[PDB]
PDB file of C-alpha atoms and ligand atoms in Angstrom:
ATOM      1  CA  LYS A   5     -15.166  -0.056  11.430  1.00  0.00           C
ATOM      2  CA  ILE A   6     -15.765  -2.237   8.094  1.00  0.00           C
ATOM      3  CA  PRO A   7     -13.631  -0.765   5.207  1.00  0.00           C
ATOM      4  CA  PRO A   8     -15.589   1.513   2.745  1.00  0.00           C
ATOM      5  CA  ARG A   9     -16.741  -0.098  -0.592  1.00  0.00           C
ATOM      6  CA  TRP A  10     -16.400  -3.566   0.662  1.00  0.00           C
ATOM      7  CA  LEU A  11     -19.865  -4.575   1.004  1.00  0.00           C
ATOM      8  CA  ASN A  12     -20.843  -4.349  -2.642  1.00  0.00           C
ATOM      9  CA  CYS A  13     -17.476  -5.670  -3.826  1.00  0.00           C
ATOM     10  CA  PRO A  14     -17.454  -9.377  -5.151  1.00  0.00           C
ATOM     11  CA  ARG A  15     -15.596 -11.708  -2.741  1.00  0.00           C
ATOM     12  CA  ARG A  16     -13.509 -13.179  -5.629  1.00  0.00           C
ATOM     13  CA  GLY A  17     -12.404 -12.716  -9.266  1.00  0.00           C
ATOM     14  CA  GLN A  18     -11.789 -15.683 -11.573  1.00  0.00           C
ATOM     15  CA  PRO A  19      -8.518 -17.433 -11.299  1.00  0.00           C
ATOM     16  CA  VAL A  20      -5.763 -15.840 -13.373  1.00  0.00           C
ATOM     17  CA  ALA A  21      -3.355 -17.862 -15.340  1.00  0.00           C
ATOM     18  CA  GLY A  22      -4.521 -20.991 -13.699  1.00  0.00           C
ATOM     19  CA  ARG A  23      -2.889 -20.028 -10.373  1.00  0.00           C
ATOM     20  CA  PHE A  24      -3.933 -16.903  -8.827  1.00  0.00           C
ATOM     21  CA  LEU A  25      -7.255 -16.164  -7.123  1.00  0.00           C
ATOM     22  CA  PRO A  26      -7.861 -12.573  -6.417  1.00  0.00           C
ATOM     23  CA  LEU A  27      -9.984 -11.712  -3.372  1.00  0.00           C
ATOM     24  CA  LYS A  28     -11.107  -8.915  -1.260  1.00  0.00           C
ATOM     25  CA  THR A  29     -10.164  -9.341   2.373  1.00  0.00           C
ATOM     26  CA  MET A  30     -12.138 -11.597   4.547  1.00  0.00           C
ATOM     27  CA  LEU A  31     -13.866 -10.009   7.636  1.00  0.00           C
ATOM     28  CA  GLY A  32     -14.086 -12.605  10.458  1.00  0.00           C
ATOM     29  CA  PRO A  33     -17.110 -12.925  12.854  1.00  0.00           C
ATOM     30  CA  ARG A  34     -15.911  -9.977  15.067  1.00  0.00           C
ATOM     31  CA  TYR A  35     -17.504  -7.781  12.117  1.00  0.00           C
ATOM     32  CA  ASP A  36     -20.815  -9.643  12.207  1.00  0.00           C
ATOM     33  CA  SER A  37     -22.774  -6.820  13.938  1.00  0.00           C
ATOM     34  CA  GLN A  38     -21.827  -4.373  11.158  1.00  0.00           C
ATOM     35  CA  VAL A  39     -22.269  -7.096   8.232  1.00  0.00           C
ATOM     36  CA  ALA A  40     -25.650  -8.503   7.256  1.00  0.00           C
ATOM     37  CA  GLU A  41     -25.670 -12.482   6.951  1.00  0.00           C
ATOM     38  CA  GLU A  42     -25.825 -12.323   3.031  1.00  0.00           C
ATOM     39  CA  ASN A  43     -22.828 -10.069   2.694  1.00  0.00           C
ATOM     40  CA  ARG A  44     -20.407 -11.799   5.142  1.00  0.00           C
ATOM     41  CA  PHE A  45     -16.990 -13.050   3.998  1.00  0.00           C
ATOM     42  CA  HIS A  46     -15.538 -15.145   6.984  1.00  0.00           C
ATOM     43  CA  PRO A  47     -12.341 -16.980   6.248  1.00  0.00           C
ATOM     44  CA  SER A  48     -14.436 -20.406   6.673  1.00  0.00           C
ATOM     45  CA  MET A  49     -16.528 -19.338   3.510  1.00  0.00           C
ATOM     46  CA  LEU A  50     -13.309 -19.234   1.271  1.00  0.00           C
ATOM     47  CA  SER A  51     -12.243 -22.459   2.669  1.00  0.00           C
ATOM     48  CA  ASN A  52     -15.453 -24.218   2.578  1.00  0.00           C
ATOM     49  CA  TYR A  53     -15.982 -23.244  -1.052  1.00  0.00           C
ATOM     50  CA  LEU A  54     -12.469 -24.527  -2.079  1.00  0.00           C
ATOM     51  CA  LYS A  55     -13.306 -27.894  -0.215  1.00  0.00           C
ATOM     52  CA  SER A  56     -16.550 -28.144  -2.207  1.00  0.00           C
ATOM     53  CA  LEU A  57     -14.678 -28.018  -5.501  1.00  0.00           C
ATOM     54  CA  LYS A  58     -11.865 -30.579  -4.189  1.00  0.00           C
ATOM     55  CA  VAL A  59      -9.300 -27.616  -4.626  1.00  0.00           C
ATOM     56  CA  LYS A  60      -6.612 -26.675  -2.413  1.00  0.00           C
ATOM     57  CA  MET A  61      -5.294 -23.313  -1.847  1.00  0.00           C
ATOM     58  CA  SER A  62      -1.439 -23.623  -1.149  1.00  0.00           C
ATOM     59  CA  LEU A  63      -0.938 -20.106   0.085  1.00  0.00           C
ATOM     60  CA  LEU A  64      -2.777 -16.898   0.873  1.00  0.00           C
ATOM     61  CA  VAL A  65      -0.931 -13.539   0.481  1.00  0.00           C
ATOM     62  CA  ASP A  66      -2.275 -10.720   2.573  1.00  0.00           C
ATOM     63  CA  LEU A  67      -1.252  -7.550   1.163  1.00  0.00           C
ATOM     64  CA  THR A  68      -3.318  -5.403   3.756  1.00  0.00           C
ATOM     65  CA  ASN A  69      -0.681  -4.278   6.183  1.00  0.00           C
ATOM     66  CA  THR A  70      -3.047  -4.919   9.015  1.00  0.00           C
ATOM     67  CA  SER A  71      -4.459  -7.856  11.425  1.00  0.00           C
ATOM     68  CA  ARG A  72      -7.614  -6.245  12.184  1.00  0.00           C
ATOM     69  CA  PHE A  73      -9.689  -7.723   9.626  1.00  0.00           C
ATOM     70  CA  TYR A  74      -9.767 -11.622  10.236  1.00  0.00           C
ATOM     71  CA  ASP A  75      -7.684 -14.158  12.401  1.00  0.00           C
ATOM     72  CA  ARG A  76      -4.862 -15.663  10.144  1.00  0.00           C
ATOM     73  CA  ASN A  77      -5.375 -19.018  12.222  1.00  0.00           C
ATOM     74  CA  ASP A  78      -8.599 -19.338  10.456  1.00  0.00           C
ATOM     75  CA  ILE A  79      -6.506 -19.905   7.266  1.00  0.00           C
ATOM     76  CA  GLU A  80      -3.520 -21.761   8.684  1.00  0.00           C
ATOM     77  CA  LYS A  81      -5.872 -24.445  10.494  1.00  0.00           C
ATOM     78  CA  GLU A  82      -6.888 -25.464   7.157  1.00  0.00           C
ATOM     79  CA  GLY A  83      -3.309 -26.161   6.050  1.00  0.00           C
ATOM     80  CA  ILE A  84      -2.872 -22.946   3.937  1.00  0.00           C
ATOM     81  CA  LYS A  85       0.151 -21.103   4.412  1.00  0.00           C
ATOM     82  CA  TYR A  86      -0.430 -17.442   5.299  1.00  0.00           C
ATOM     83  CA  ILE A  87       1.915 -14.514   4.584  1.00  0.00           C
ATOM     84  CA  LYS A  88       1.366 -10.854   5.451  1.00  0.00           C
ATOM     85  CA  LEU A  89       3.332  -9.027   2.765  1.00  0.00           C
ATOM     86  CA  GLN A  90       3.820  -5.385   3.898  1.00  0.00           C
ATOM     87  CA  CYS A  91       3.644  -3.031   0.741  1.00  0.00           C
ATOM     88  CA  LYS A  92       4.658   0.398   0.179  1.00  0.00           C
ATOM     89  CA  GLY A  93       2.034   2.844   1.658  1.00  0.00           C
ATOM     90  CA  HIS A  94       0.739   6.428   1.150  1.00  0.00           C
ATOM     91  CA  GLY A  95      -1.241   4.962  -1.965  1.00  0.00           C
ATOM     92  CA  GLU A  96       2.079   4.346  -3.922  1.00  0.00           C
ATOM     93  CA  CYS A  97       2.364   1.207  -6.035  1.00  0.00           C
ATOM     94  CA  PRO A  98       4.441  -1.564  -4.674  1.00  0.00           C
ATOM     95  CA  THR A  99       8.186  -1.129  -4.950  1.00  0.00           C
ATOM     96  CA  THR A 100      10.579  -3.275  -6.935  1.00  0.00           C
ATOM     97  CA  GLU A 101      11.484  -4.694  -3.531  1.00  0.00           C
ATOM     98  CA  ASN A 102       8.004  -5.684  -2.809  1.00  0.00           C
ATOM     99  CA  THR A 103       7.497  -7.207  -6.073  1.00  0.00           C
ATOM    100  CA  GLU A 104      10.622  -9.284  -5.708  1.00  0.00           C
ATOM    101  CA  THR A 105       9.273 -10.286  -2.347  1.00  0.00           C
ATOM    102  CA  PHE A 106       6.028 -11.581  -3.942  1.00  0.00           C
ATOM    103  CA  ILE A 107       7.860 -13.402  -6.757  1.00  0.00           C
ATOM    104  CA  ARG A 108      10.340 -15.055  -4.433  1.00  0.00           C
ATOM    105  CA  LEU A 109       7.610 -16.284  -2.199  1.00  0.00           C
ATOM    106  CA  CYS A 110       5.042 -17.263  -4.885  1.00  0.00           C
ATOM    107  CA  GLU A 111       7.686 -19.218  -7.116  1.00  0.00           C
ATOM    108  CA  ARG A 112       8.050 -21.759  -4.109  1.00  0.00           C
ATOM    109  CA  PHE A 113       4.365 -22.693  -4.559  1.00  0.00           C
ATOM    110  CA  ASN A 114       3.049 -22.256  -8.216  1.00  0.00           C
ATOM    111  CA  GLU A 115       4.562 -25.497  -9.317  1.00  0.00           C
ATOM    112  CA  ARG A 116       2.666 -27.822  -7.018  1.00  0.00           C
ATOM    113  CA  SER A 117       1.097 -31.134  -8.341  1.00  0.00           C
ATOM    114  CA  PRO A 118      -1.620 -31.679  -8.082  1.00  0.00           C
ATOM    115  CA  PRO A 119      -2.181 -27.873  -8.766  1.00  0.00           C
ATOM    116  CA  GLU A 120      -3.197 -25.614  -6.002  1.00  0.00           C
ATOM    117  CA  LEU A 121      -4.247 -21.853  -6.259  1.00  0.00           C
ATOM    118  CA  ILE A 122      -2.371 -18.801  -4.619  1.00  0.00           C
ATOM    119  CA  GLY A 123      -4.946 -16.571  -3.055  1.00  0.00           C
ATOM    120  CA  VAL A 124      -3.874 -12.700  -3.082  1.00  0.00           C
ATOM    121  CA  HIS A 125      -5.930  -9.839  -1.392  1.00  0.00           C
ATOM    122  CA  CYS A 126      -5.625  -6.452  -0.341  1.00  0.00           C
ATOM    123  CA  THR A 127      -8.614  -4.650   0.940  1.00  0.00           C
ATOM    124  CA  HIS A 128     -10.585  -4.621  -2.194  1.00  0.00           C
ATOM    125  CA  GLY A 129      -8.686  -6.922  -4.361  1.00  0.00           C
ATOM    126  CA  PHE A 130      -8.188  -4.928  -7.430  1.00  0.00           C
ATOM    127  CA  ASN A 131      -5.128  -2.504  -7.213  1.00  0.00           C
ATOM    128  CA  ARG A 132      -2.183  -3.836  -5.216  1.00  0.00           C
ATOM    129  CA  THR A 133      -3.509  -7.441  -5.963  1.00  0.00           C
ATOM    130  CA  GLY A 134      -3.756  -6.930  -9.641  1.00  0.00           C
ATOM    131  CA  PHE A 135      -0.371  -5.139  -9.592  1.00  0.00           C
ATOM    132  CA  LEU A 136       1.577  -8.190  -8.009  1.00  0.00           C
ATOM    133  CA  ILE A 137      -0.235 -10.834 -10.211  1.00  0.00           C
ATOM    134  CA  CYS A 138       0.677  -8.917 -13.370  1.00  0.00           C
ATOM    135  CA  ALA A 139       4.264  -8.409 -12.248  1.00  0.00           C
ATOM    136  CA  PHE A 140       4.445 -12.187 -11.416  1.00  0.00           C
ATOM    137  CA  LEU A 141       2.815 -13.011 -14.842  1.00  0.00           C
ATOM    138  CA  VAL A 142       5.390 -10.976 -16.787  1.00  0.00           C
ATOM    139  CA  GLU A 143       8.437 -11.837 -14.829  1.00  0.00           C
ATOM    140  CA  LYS A 144       7.926 -15.465 -14.097  1.00  0.00           C
ATOM    141  CA  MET A 145       5.434 -16.610 -16.733  1.00  0.00           C
ATOM    142  CA  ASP A 146       6.662 -14.689 -19.747  1.00  0.00           C
ATOM    143  CA  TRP A 147       3.254 -13.042 -20.433  1.00  0.00           C
ATOM    144  CA  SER A 148       3.315  -9.582 -21.895  1.00  0.00           C
ATOM    145  CA  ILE A 149       2.020  -6.807 -19.559  1.00  0.00           C
ATOM    146  CA  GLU A 150      -0.708  -6.168 -22.062  1.00  0.00           C
ATOM    147  CA  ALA A 151      -1.991  -9.597 -21.762  1.00  0.00           C
ATOM    148  CA  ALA A 152      -1.771  -9.703 -17.980  1.00  0.00           C
ATOM    149  CA  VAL A 153      -3.603  -6.375 -17.534  1.00  0.00           C
ATOM    150  CA  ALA A 154      -6.226  -7.414 -19.704  1.00  0.00           C
ATOM    151  CA  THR A 155      -6.698 -10.622 -18.442  1.00  0.00           C
ATOM    152  CA  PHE A 156      -6.816  -9.258 -14.940  1.00  0.00           C
ATOM    153  CA  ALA A 157      -9.534  -6.738 -15.873  1.00  0.00           C
ATOM    154  CA  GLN A 158     -11.641  -9.552 -17.171  1.00  0.00           C
ATOM    155  CA  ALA A 159     -10.977 -11.965 -14.335  1.00  0.00           C
ATOM    156  CA  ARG A 160     -11.705  -9.141 -11.688  1.00  0.00           C
ATOM    157  CA  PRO A 161     -13.663  -6.380 -13.178  1.00  0.00           C
ATOM    158  CA  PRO A 162     -12.924  -3.654 -13.585  1.00  0.00           C
ATOM    159  CA  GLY A 163      -9.135  -4.748 -12.848  1.00  0.00           C
ATOM    160  CA  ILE A 164      -6.579  -2.261 -11.806  1.00  0.00           C
ATOM    161  CA  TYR A 165      -8.405   1.024 -11.755  1.00  0.00           C
ATOM    162  CA  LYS A 166      -5.419   3.398 -10.463  1.00  0.00           C
ATOM    163  CA  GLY A 167      -3.800   5.025 -13.447  1.00  0.00           C
ATOM    164  CA  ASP A 168      -0.628   5.359 -11.680  1.00  0.00           C
ATOM    165  CA  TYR A 169      -0.389   1.670 -11.281  1.00  0.00           C
ATOM    166  CA  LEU A 170      -1.198   1.008 -14.950  1.00  0.00           C
ATOM    167  CA  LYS A 171       1.588   3.408 -15.710  1.00  0.00           C
ATOM    168  CA  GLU A 172       4.108   2.108 -13.408  1.00  0.00           C
ATOM    169  CA  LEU A 173       3.456  -1.431 -14.814  1.00  0.00           C
ATOM    170  CA  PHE A 174       3.875  -0.302 -18.493  1.00  0.00           C
ATOM    171  CA  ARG A 175       6.979   1.846 -17.321  1.00  0.00           C
ATOM    172  CA  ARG A 176       8.528  -1.398 -15.726  1.00  0.00           C
ATOM    173  CA  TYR A 177       7.432  -4.061 -18.418  1.00  0.00           C
ATOM    174  CA  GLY A 178       6.438  -2.360 -21.672  1.00  0.00           C
ATOM    175  CA  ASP A 179       6.168   1.204 -22.970  1.00  0.00           C
ATOM    176  CA  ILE A 180       4.966   3.832 -20.517  1.00  0.00           C
ATOM    177  CA  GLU A 181       3.513   5.769 -23.549  1.00  0.00           C
ATOM    178  CA  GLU A 182       1.211   2.883 -24.281  1.00  0.00           C
ATOM    179  CA  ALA A 183      -0.102   2.372 -20.828  1.00  0.00           C
ATOM    180  CA  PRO A 184      -4.011   2.343 -20.718  1.00  0.00           C
ATOM    181  CA  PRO A 185      -6.243   5.044 -18.997  1.00  0.00           C
ATOM    182  CA  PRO A 186      -7.832   3.670 -15.865  1.00  0.00           C
ATOM    183  CA  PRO A 187     -11.348   2.164 -16.720  1.00  0.00           C
ATOM    184  CA  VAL A 188     -14.480   3.678 -15.963  1.00  0.00           C
ATOM    185  CA  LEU A 189     -15.862   2.325 -12.804  1.00  0.00           C
ATOM    186  CA  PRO A 190     -19.139   0.460 -12.540  1.00  0.00           C
ATOM    187  CA  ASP A 191     -22.043   2.155 -10.408  1.00  0.00           C
ATOM    188  CA  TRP A 192     -21.594  -0.342  -7.186  1.00  0.00           C
ATOM    189  CA  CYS A 193     -18.226   1.320  -6.232  1.00  0.00           C
ATOM    190  CA  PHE A 194     -20.061   4.389  -4.832  1.00  0.00           C
TER     191      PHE A 194
HETATM  192  C1  CAC B 201     -13.712  -1.201  -8.064  1.00  0.00           C
HETATM  193 AS1  CAC B 201     -14.840   0.134  -6.914  1.00  0.00          AS
HETATM  194  C2  CAC B 201     -13.556   1.839  -7.152  1.00  0.00           C
HETATM  195 MG1   MG B 202     -13.578 -18.121  15.187  1.00  0.00          MG
END
């Protein structure tokens, strides 16, 4: 069955720090009977959009822990590197090991010229996706965690919305006492 709350979720956010493109998961043609034409998001739709802007994606990081949504070959056949990065389950935020894995991978690709984007997606494109992007911005790009979280909230509204995720990012990179409460969600979520 298609994931819950996916149909109304925007396919992509704005790019973050000129490098990361946050996305919800694509769903291949296997789900066409459950998804109306206007709401589809096959992998081809992402690559055709990038081609239309003369933009290349160097790497797509899939944080879903499943291969049931789309065919990784639809990404790889276009010359985009595909990585399935398994993250801590049970609703917990990504571990320090997961974040190191993500940073080790993305640092091999973030400095290409000409510039290319790194796509990042979980099922919906907000919590695991925003957590790992923020961790990279702080650890490798020297942004403050306040700036990272606020930029991700404006690029992919409403941003990270699990309060435990926000608190863990501030415990790791700032002052846990200053972590913001989760945002109030928009009506489309439910
Ligand atoms: C972004 As909906 C919970
Ligand atoms: Mg096909």
